[PDB]
Chain length 329, copies 6
């Protein structure tokens, strides 16, 4: 219910809440690697969000090293305006209890968002919320840590509305294309990409028009997230070299209404920040509409505008302005 929904889960925990900042790129780093950890302060200034990875691609015998590594660099660095995230290990894993506990105790006040792998339903959120609450109380954390659900299974997608509404800590969703495709039996040629042979064959009179595999999944993620006041994110794109397909894929997500994407390499940072910023062409035709009608009321014009298009324009202009603090247009 609404009455106890906003009440704290544990006594001494901070009052429940979305904070407004740009989240165009979520940059992942391996905490166990000294070379990457050494340059975190310099790299943090080049990204909107910086996310520590304890999960996929961190070896079993390096879980404790990655965990401790994350804790060292988040304690010692001033991250300025860069949001600090962490992806902990899965809720069925041998590392998750230690992950969450240690990170809250040492750097809880520094952590904005916690990414939970493979969220299957509201019960997963209920556990993380209550656990974080008790740990926040224990270590006197002033600002509650938000929860970001990674969608990696069919059950999760089916349970998306329940997951979205399970806690006031919810921040958003990221698509986990590798695992989600594997779960569904969905076949793709690149992580976070489509497939060349998914398309319609024209009637013999032959051409083959390729279709997007992720349309339903993204459209669904965006409706559920936005209806709850959360943010949807495209996850990673796995083919680091194919920069044109990355931009194509990221751009599709931006237009359907995602806020950002993951970067898994330095070359993906500029693509993401570029793509999830509004195109200056559209900001002009947008500012044209805001100028045509001073307020929401009215009609304009060879395309019909109104209060609705004014709202469409306000979205694109409210975003392009938040980012520039740069384009500056």
């Amino acid at each position: 219910l609404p009455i106890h929904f906003y009440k704290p889960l544990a006594a001494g925990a901070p009052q429940p809440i979305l904070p407004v900042r740009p989240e165009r790129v979520i940059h992942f780093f391996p905490p166990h690697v000294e070379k990457i950890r050494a340059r975190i302060p310099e790299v943090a200034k080049q990204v909107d969000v910086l996310c520590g990875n304890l999960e996929d691609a961190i070896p079993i015998d390096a879980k404790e090293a990655a965990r401790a590594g994350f804790i060292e660099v988040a304690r010692n660095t001033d991250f300025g305006d860069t949001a600090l995230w962490v992806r902990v290990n899965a809720l069925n894993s041998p590392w998750v209890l230690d992950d969450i506990a240690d990170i809250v105790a040492t750097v809880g006040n520094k952590l904005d968002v916690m990414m939970i792998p493979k969220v299957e339903g509201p019960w997963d959120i209920h556990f993380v919320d209550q656990y974080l609450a008790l740990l926040e109380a224990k270590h006197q954390i002033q600002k509650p840590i938000l929860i970001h659900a990674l969608l990696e299974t069919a059950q999760g997608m089916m349970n998306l509305e329940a997951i979205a509404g399970a806690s006031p800590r919810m921040h958003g969703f990221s698509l986990g294309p590798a695992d989600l495709a594997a779960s569904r039996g969905m076949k793709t040629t690149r992580v976070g990409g489509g497939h060349p042979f998914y398309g319609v064959l024209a009637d013999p009179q032959r051409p083959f028009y390729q279709q997007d595999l992720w349309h339903y999944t993204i459209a669904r993620m965006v409706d559920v997230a936005v209806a709850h006041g959360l943010r949807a994110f495209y996850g990673p794109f796995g083919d680091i070299k194919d920069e044109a397909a990355c931009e194509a894929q990221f751009r599709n997500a931006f237009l359907l209404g995602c806020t950002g994407a993951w970067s898994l390499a330095p070359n993906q940072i500029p693509i993401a920040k570029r793509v999830f910023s509004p195109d200056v062409n559209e900001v002009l035709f947008a500012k044209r509409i805001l100028d045509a009608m001073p307020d929401g009321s009215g009609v304009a014009m060879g395309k019909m505008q109104d209060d609705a298009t004014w709202k469409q324009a306000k979205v694109i202009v409210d975003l392009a302005r938040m980012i520039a603090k740069d384009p500056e247009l």
Copy 2:
């Protein structure tokens, strides 16, 4: 949410019996018009005969300074005109606005007996339907309105998309849904200012052999709307196509909607009327397979098979609807007269 035994009761003493089935009539085009401007007011009796459905507009595209005028406007023209077979609809202001109380009050008081459907903008959930249902019921009772004013839901918000089943099932007054892709794009945060066509940057990039195949922004949205609506015996509609000039694009979008299963589209100017009518006219193969259902089952009883497909009371009742709707279109189009065969 309501139990069947109560669902079909009138919400006010004296208010008209809630309907069981949707009234069957032409709705291939819904022609919007600003009622505050006298030039268009004067042509309404002309335009009325051109269109299946006429719909006055009090909400978006009507400035704050002329809302009152759009209200009076709508009543003036509705009083004076006999609309014949053309349906009279109205789009009132939002349920949070200062104009909606009087919008609904004065219209039922003056022209309720002529108003066929009321269109509610920015519906978030079933509570919205509930209020309007109950408010209409009480107003219909006061002014002794003879048949229930139906509710048409504008699908303009993320919350509405999420709550689409609850909305569809909230009232027997429910007629159907119209996609409002301008508002729905602002609500979702879809990054376009365009009002519901393709978009150049939404597409798939092929593998190195680089071709770029545009995709349809609204496949999920319309597919979802058709399923929910049709499951509840309601009608989905595509809404506005804001690029008035680009008739090539408008036909394609109207045709997409038609093939997914919508019943009709909006027209925002005279050039879109004939396009909407062309696209949304029933499939000839549809109409002729229905006639066969009807002729093979004398009084809709028993069971008969046609092209290897068993037919029954459900398929017969859907046959009589499509045939009925065909005849009604043929009455004001000669091409479709012999096409369906009337």
Copy 3:
């Protein structure tokens, strides 16, 4: 909607224990046949070995005066034949129809111990499953059937699509779903030029190019939503999603392309309406070699299936291991009657 503790109980005294897991077997092709035609019935034992699943048809395209022949035909062929590895299905008549009572009761009374799945047309909600589930259970106890007859639901109405979660979870007899695109298209205001396929006029038109006259028109797929929705619900319930039939029996390319779109989204298999379609299905819905090879690495890294491991960066546990055993056991069973794949899967 039933409680877990009651879900797996038999609905009749003497009915066999319901399953907690779909049997794993090849289901790449569901080959249909009219059991009334005596020439097809003669060739069934030969056709058996060429297909993963043989499904008798009593419903669409079996005439009213043929219904009782098809019912007896199917009972006759099933009693005479030993299907070996081939699964025996049957699409009975609709739940409003005059034949369905006798269809189910006669088939279970006679050959119930040989039927693996029963296909129910035009399933509109959990109530339809509840009827069939309870009916089968009482027939199964009377005739002492040894393993449960599963229910396969045919998606033919808007109502069904909207109630798909409720259908999927209605019973432990649930096997999965097939799309009936002719009916589902009719039910929705959907326009299709062929039963299996979409429409050429469903497409996106480009913005005006200053240069050329011809604005490009990119055809779109009508069935994307439907199939993506069908796969998510089915897989989330532990069931399988199947594409239905493709009508243009001539058009083998279109048949390959639509079968393939379904496979790439996660469907297990397709219907074959004609002998040319049989090999088109088996080719497309064969498990991918990479998935099979990868699954073998999981099984190797976790011998007894316990503990936890990490392969290609990814944690492996009792769920991934169990899932990897399913595809390996399925690849084995396919390689058993297909030496070309035995080499590819590396057995």
Copy 4:
């Protein structure tokens, strides 16, 4: 569950249209009879006159080797007897039993157009209703039954009590509910000293008072929760709630107490197991209950006023003292 647009459609082609409103008639007593016994079958034409409802029993108290005889017995009396205004009901065997498929099939075939209500034992949830609903429809169509046979749910398990709202709204065939006291008690693990009874040791002990050592023990009603929940759920769905059996045949006083309690809480009637219980039920469950007496009146309370008036006249059309007393 099902949507209002589809709720009232037939479930088989040729099956009679679902009712939108429950039929009004006296249901003060539902008199059970074992149809395998020849003596009782003889007396049914007489007994039909003395009861509002006659219910043949195929389930409890009918032995395993008498099931076929009971199934045939009930059919014999069904097609012979002219029931007049007396409604005819049957309690088939449970849905998990080896007799229920033939119970329903044979009865609908032979005497289906004389059956008003079918009583289903041990209704656990809406799935049980879905099965019976769909099965009756297919049998109704095959045999061209002219009006729908209604479903009356026996509540005999805790699950059924928990699923009560979902059961109630499962089908427009739904008529209402009866208490299966013995079986509901045994499912819950309640302890009663008689079927349909209660327990003298369920009570509230007073505090010690003054100097009087004897602390009074106030007995409590065990069924108050059950019947209150059953009535609220039944009446909200437009159905009727009945008290089940009262197994202590000889204690006519206690029988009256229990039936009266049900009636005061809103139940329509009760079962009679023997002929001494017939008059107890009819006595106890017999009652006439704009702006008059401070309350507004409308379409809703006019319909309910007409239901009680019609019931009174039909009650009166056979009962002359009550015809004289009600003023008809």
Copy 5:
């Protein structure tokens, strides 16, 4: 929906309140506003009751609806209710008087009305209508504090949908039992409005010697009141016993009210002057109980552990039981000098 629950449902109307106001609500005194003699003495009566509630619905004849409407507006406009809350029971949602009842009252005296009681509520849809309608009116007439909603439970359907009704809006205040209408809706038989029946009871088993079987009467309203309390309290709302119709049987009235109080109801209605003092006495904590509870709070300053007090043993939980009783006692004592004395403040 929790983010959209606490939004204003109209632009101009005030922010939906985060929690209920904290005043005593032991008696809800009803008055027919169409009667001049009654309106004249409302300022005097108001000083003796926690809540005063105008009635436009039942007991008001059809001829008097306009007069009762106008009479309520005139009383509320001219009177200063002080610490007394002002309610009104408007007519039913299916009736020809309700549109005007709500509209006229909000326009004229919206800033003086604390709670609007809605008759015959059957589901959350009823609540949706009123919330939205009040929101629009409040905006139009710039009403500073939002008018709360109070649901009368007078139907089986209402009892069945109780959870949905309670969660339907943040305006929700609580529930009152409408036991006459609820008995009729249910088919109950009561001998009095909102009262038990003499013949609802248990017959003891046959004895050996006395041969008169004792007959232990039972409470018709247990299930109902227990369900209302649980649902209301679980949503942060208050439950109220409705009207006790038998004005002259003050013993029965007291007993019925007290039963409600024990099971967790906050107050009951008053229909006549004799019921005012009964409701205030019955819905005020007992003196001894308050004192027995007073020293528990002393025995455990922390509210933690065990502690012997007189002969009894208390723990964290009985401390909570105690804090409730004492918190209420201290609130009533602010405006009753006599109870303040006896409670020991």
Copy 6:
């Protein structure tokens, strides 16, 4: 809210397989003890033999400053004791409390293999259960716990009463519910300080006789609702504490009410309550005898038989087994009942 296909899966790799059926054992009396009191701690090996269930208590009645001693105390006496046929329970602190994280981790780490049931207080909804389920599993995998630790939900809050079905269905760890009358009275705002008996001024006043007041049962609705939700989920309902230790006549009456409405057993707060709970909640003899008959009429437990006009089947056979088994295990330590049941 979880599907049956996922419901019986462990929530952590290494965690024991969830159960599909409650263990059957005597649970007529839940004896509570404060584990921080050495004098009581020292007697537990003897008291253990006198009771069906022993439940350590870390929550209400344990002072704030004794909470850590109470935890350590529970661990000490559980480590060093062979509880034989007696079940070991613990009531940990509330989920919004500074002691509960460590309560659970430490108990599971040290004595998790001896712990049968973990009682959770002040349960408000399924989310509480979800948290405990997932927490226990991660600890169970970490410490290689062989059998799943079950969850007992204390019914003490108005929210818990309203959310009873969701709580009951939330996990295959669910054991059952105990009515916590003091906390439930405070939560509801019931106007009593008594802990779970009658109240003299809750009653029905009769009409003038040619004026008797019949006291009513405060807890009819609450127990009736608890029994229905729990039995439908294959769980067990229990009456909680009866606080008036002196008044044994009232305690027996309140326990018997619970028993007559379908509760399995009650809490004992003092040694005089132990025999009372044991006496009241022992299976009635006609229930055991009728159960014996069901097993004899169907030696296999298969097919369909009939007894006293009532069809018997695979489900009723399953129930008769439970009762007989339970009566057999009670006889094992009580010669008097052994006779009455026929062993």
